[PDB]
Design a protein around this nucleic acid. Structure first.
Ligand SMILES: Nc1ncnc2c1ncn2[C@@H]1O[C@H](COP(=O)(O)OP(=O)(O)OP(O)(O)=S)[C@@H](O)[C@H]1O
Ligand SMILES: Nc1ncnc2c1ncn2[C@@H]1O[C@H](COP(=O)(O)OP(=O)(O)OP(O)(O)=S)[C@@H](O)[C@H]1O
Lengths: 53, 149, 249, 558
DNA sequence: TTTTTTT
């Protein structure tokens, strides 16, 4: 019952895939790359646990 | 000119003013339309599009400028604008299920963030509703007008 | 005696006017027949409303009537009948908090507001409320700390005028006197001698009523300047009395 | 023969006094010049005349008595004489049975305004073969003022077989409206529901009274309809022939008085005609009556400028006695006590088969003052709508009839008690009220009033209330509406440096004592210097107004 | 389409 949750659902992965999909849509080129999904992981690790300060 | 006036718009209507014949001498009026000039021209009706899109692409640092451009009237909240840009994207879709290209991000926290961004979302993107202002029939049956719906 | 006459009425350059009639409380132990007293209070004044508790068969309290011709109209209530009169409320602790707020205001600023579906007026209510309560567990409420009576707060009592506590102490001569006094009331009309008393004192109740009608609108009372410094020096002593019972305790 | 004699006699009298003649001269010259300016660069006034009851008394008391006794014989020929001259030139309580069939002056409140419908009077019809026009009129009991034979069907094919094509434009029309006016409620008898009647207006006076104002009415008591002798109590009533009734030395006194430096304090003490102390509280009521500035942003939304204060305090510090002073001194306010269900924040539309609206309490107090009594005693139902009213300045009503959206930018004052007893500083500064958390940031000032017992204070309260039982106000509201139209201010650089340091104080040290600290507080920091500039009628914004506001924040909270 | 109830 700490700041972090217990389990990770597969919908988390479904959401981050759709998120990186939209990130590729902002490139307007269908150029799904490593940074495309890396930005999707960045808004997850930064979206959560922003209560450090 | 029939079937040409969407509800909830801004339009210049011209006409002639005539009453209608029916306590004994009560005249109910109306207007006969003569010309339609609609403000707020409807989209989707590519040249002028790429005239600014190609310049937007070649502008340099486009990705930060796009999310920076949606509702710049607040200070800070850069990642929040990133989430608003990604909510504005959406757009995704055999013998199974399709995929919904919709994003549902909730917001928790208080207080100076509070409606300033909330009304702004429907500004950039929108019907603003509250709790009691919509009843059980509001967000989801009436007597049919002139034209059991 | 002081309630049936009514004090002064000030129409100052100040945006408000003050209040004239007074309020009577009778919290105390049961069996006192304070009930009979409040009934006779209703019989004496020309216009007054007597209410026994929060729950009726048929007696209401700003009325909202919506219906023929599909028209909204204002019917009435109880404070409306007693504008400029006496209101008797029995069972002060047996009462709900549903329209109690109207009573929490009617005795202090005389201004009932209505902002409903039909009307949007601000009306007048010149009433005076008379209370008759019962503390919890009867006579034991004074054996613990002397408060412990109204569970909500004491601001309603601060908005009243007079607070009386009825006790019950044995005195055999007083007990025999209250006994045979009441037997004489029931039987053999001994206390009921009154006709020679009528010949010598207080010939009628209806006489008292006609006298109050004559008394209210004629005199224009006001205090006297030599008596004002007495009250100014006295309010100091009462507030000091509360300082003594409060700060050291 | 009688009609022309009354016409010529009143015409002679109107020709006797030329004082009204030059008035009509100015009417005609102004309308001529108005049509002259409207027809030269680019390439209103009616005909009814206020006649004083002055000269009619000095000319013929027979004719005087005839007007106020039988007006149905002298007003039409007098107007006929006036139109001829125009062409030659170019209480409800004691109202029934007696004080009847005369001209009656009525006072009261404007309430429940009806709907606007136009009415036809003069028809124009064109015949095809003859190539001529025609003429046909129709009358009803509202227009004639005299019992004449009613002539109602729209004509076609009258005489020969010529098509009576009707025409328009040239065919005349006049609007029509009926309203109800109940008398003033304080004037009522011992205790009763006030009772009312109605008065019908005419063409140039349609939509002059909204529901909720103070109006004097002068008109004629007209009774129409067949009173039950048609086919059980008839002879319904109304009122016609109507008028609407709501200095340089003085304004020089205003400009002259305003040339001082401490009138804020003088007016502060002026507004305490019967209450001791609470100096800065009166200062805050001055700033609320100032109303602040309104600055709508570039392609954004408007920003609310008025200020709202709710009170809390020991139950004996004029909490409810401060309210009626603000009621009488300001303009267009409505006091709400206790409950406000079904009609504070809404209109409810319960009204031919149609849906109409009745402006609720929050809407009717637009550009005004809302007096709320017993805010915690308000039921929990309307508490949701209060956030919307107080923050977006709009009311959206979405019932089954029609969803709408309108504007109300009212000023609101509330007065509440602590939760239990007098423990206002004893327990904790937080939740001594048990209100929602957003309402803390919604309200501007939160006063905490104690009942501190002392002796200098005790004696001063004694002589104040005691002599109570044994520079002025009308100068002030004139000073207010005059200070509204030319004293609107603009922010300066000096307004920034103080409130910035002040907001730093609000976050670095104010949180160590109480809460909250919002940006709305900084908006109030701008609004207070604005209202101080309106009271002093300055045009710029001074540092000194902010110096005042620092004490206003300390006195309101710390 | 709004006023007195009770689980
Ligand atoms: N002198 C008297 N003293 C007390 N009771 C009397 C007296 N004379 C007659 N009674 C009767 O005795 C009853 C006693 O009850 P009350 O005096 O009404 O007690 P109570 O305190 O009113 O209880 P309540 O009404 O619930 S507060 C009265 O209601 C009368 O019927
Ligand atoms: N400083 C003061 N100067 C003059 N009158 C005062 C002062 N403080 C209190 N009052 C009295 O305020 C009394 C009315 O007080 P209220 O505020 O109506 O009491 P209340 O119980 O708080 O009212 P509510 O609405 O029920 S909260 C009047 O009798 C005034 O004389």
């Amino acid at each position: 019952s700490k700041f972090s949750f217990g389990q990770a659902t597969p919908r988390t992965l479904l959401g981050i895939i759709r998120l990186s999909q939209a990130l590729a849509k902002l490139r307007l080129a269908d150029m799904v790359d490593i940074d495309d999904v890396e930005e999707a992981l960045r808004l997850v690790r930064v979206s959560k646990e922003s209560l450090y300060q | 000119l029939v079937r040409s006036l969407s509800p909830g718009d801004i339009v210049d209507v011209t006409g002639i003013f005539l009453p209608a014949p029916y306590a004994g001498l009560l005249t109910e009026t109306y207007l006969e339309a003569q010309f339609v000039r609609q403000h707020k021209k409807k989209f989707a009706s590519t040249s002028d599009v790429e005239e600014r899109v190609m310049e937007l692409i070649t502008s340099g640092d486009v990705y930060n400028r796009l999310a920076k451009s949606i509702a710049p009237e607040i200070y800070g909240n850069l990642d929040v604008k990133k989430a608003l840009l990604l909510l504005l994207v959406g757009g995704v879709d055999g013998d199974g299920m399709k995929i919904r290209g919709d994003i549902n991000v909730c917001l928790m926290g208080d207080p100076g963030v509070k409606s300033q961004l909330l009304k702004a979302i429907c500004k950039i993107s929108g019907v603003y509703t509250t709790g009691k202002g919509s009843s059980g029939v509001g967000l989801t049956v009436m007597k049919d007008p002139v034209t059991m719906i | 005696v002081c309630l049936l006459m009514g004090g002064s009425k000030k129409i100052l350059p100040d945006g408000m006017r003050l209040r004239g009639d007074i309020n009577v409380l009778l919290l105390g132990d049961p069996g006192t027949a304070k009930s009979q007293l409040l009934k006779f209070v209703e019989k004496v004044s020309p216009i007054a409303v007597y209410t026994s508790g929060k729950g009726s068969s048929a007696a209401g309290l700003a009325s909202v009537q919506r219906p023929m011709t599909r028209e909204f109209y204002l019917e009435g209530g109880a404070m409306v009948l007693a504008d400029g009169g006496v209101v008797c409320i029995d069972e002060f602790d047996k009462m709900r908090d549903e329209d109690r707020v109207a009573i929490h205001e009617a005795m202090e600023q005389q201004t009932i507001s209505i902002a409903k579906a039909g009307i949007t007026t601000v009306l007048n209510s010149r009433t005076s409320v008379l209370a008759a309560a019962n503390p919890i567990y009867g006579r034991y409420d004074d054996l613990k700390s002397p408060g412990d009576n109204i569970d909500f707060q004491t601001t309603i009592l601060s908005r009243f005028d007079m607070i009386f506590i009825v006790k019950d102490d044995h005195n055999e001569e007083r007990d025999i006197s209250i006994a045979n006094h009441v037997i004489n009331i029931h039987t053999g009309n001994a206390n009921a001698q009154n006709q020679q008393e009528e010949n010598g004192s207080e010939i009628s109740i209806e006489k008292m009523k006609r006298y109050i009608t004559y008394c209210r609108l004629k005199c224009a009372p006001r205090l006297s300047p030599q008596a004002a410094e007495k009250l100014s020096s006295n309010f100091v002593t009462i507030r000091k009395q509360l300082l003594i019972n409060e700060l050291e305790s | 023969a009688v009609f022309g004699d009354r016409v010529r006699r009143f015409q002679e009298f109107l020709d006797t006094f030329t004082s009204y003649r030059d008035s009509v001269r100015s009417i005609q010259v102004y309308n001529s010049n108005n049509a002259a300016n409207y027809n030269d660069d680019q390439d209103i006034l009616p005909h009814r005349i206020i006649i004083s009851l002055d000269d009619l008394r000095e000319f013929d008391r027979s004719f005087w008595s005839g007007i106020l006794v039988e007006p149905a014989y002298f007003i039409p020929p007098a107007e006929k004489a006036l139109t001829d001259l125009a062409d030659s030139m170019d209480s409800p309580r004691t109202l029934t049975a007696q004080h009847l069939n005369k001209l009656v002056s009525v006072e009261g409140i404007v309430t429940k305004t009806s709907l606007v419908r136009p009415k036809l009077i003069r028809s124009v019809h064109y015949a095809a073969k003859t190539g001529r026009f025609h003429y046909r009129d129709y009358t009803d009991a509202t227009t004639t003022l005299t019992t004449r034979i009613p002539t109602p069907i729209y004509p076609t094919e009258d005489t020969e077989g010529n098509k009576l094509t009707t025409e328009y434009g040239y065919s005349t029309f006049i609007d029509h409206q009926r309203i109800t006016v109940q008398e003033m409620p304080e004037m009522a008898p011992a205790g009763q529901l006030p009772r009312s009647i109605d008065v019908i207006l005419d063409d140039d006076l349609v939509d002059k009274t909204k529901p909720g104002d103070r109006v004097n009415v002068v008109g004629v008591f007209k009774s129409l309809g067949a009173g039950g002798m048609n086919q059980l109590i008839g002879f319904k009533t109304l009122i016609l022939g109507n008028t609407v009734y709501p200095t340089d030395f003085d304004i020089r006194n205003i400009n002259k008085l305003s040339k001082k430096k401490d009138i804020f304090d003088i007016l502060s003490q002026s507004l305490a005609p019967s209450i001791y102390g609470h100096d800065h509280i009166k200062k805050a009521i001055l700033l609320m009556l100032m109303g602040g500035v309104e600055k709508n942003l570039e392609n954004g939304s408007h920003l609310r400028g008025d200020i709202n204060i709710l009170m809390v305090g020991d139950p004996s510090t004029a909490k409810s006695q401060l309210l009626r002073f603000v009621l009488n001194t300001a303009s267009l306010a409505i006091a709400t006590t206790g409950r406000g269900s079904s009609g504070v924040g809404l209109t409810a539309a319960v009204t031919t088969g149609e849906r109409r609206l009745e402006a609720g309490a929050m809407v009717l107090a637009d550009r005004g003052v809302v007096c709320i009594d017993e805010f915690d005693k308000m039921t929990d139902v309307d508490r949701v709508a209060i956030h919307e009213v107080m923050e977006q300045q709009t009311v959206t009503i979405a019932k089954a009839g029609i969803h709408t959206t309108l504007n109300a930018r009212c000023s609101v004052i509330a007065a509440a008690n602590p939760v239990f007893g007098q423990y206002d500083v004893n327990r904790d500064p937080h939740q001594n009220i048990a209100l929602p958390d957003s309402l803390l940031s919604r309200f501007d000032l939160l006063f905490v009033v104690t009942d501190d017992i002392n002796e200098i204070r005790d004696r001063s309260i004694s002589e104040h209330v005691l002599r109570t039982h044994r520079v002025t106000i009308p100068f002030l509201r004139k000073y207010v509406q005059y200070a509204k139209e030319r004293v609107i201010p603009q922010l300066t650089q000096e307004a920034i440096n103080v409130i910035v340091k002040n907001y730093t104080d609000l976050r670095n040290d104010d949180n160590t004592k109480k809460s909250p600290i919002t940006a709305r507080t900084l908006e109030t920091l701008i609004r207070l210097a604005t209202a101080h500039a309106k009271v002093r009628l300055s045009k710029t914004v001074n540092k000194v107004d902010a110096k005042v506001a620092a004490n206003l924040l300390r006195f309101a909270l710390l």
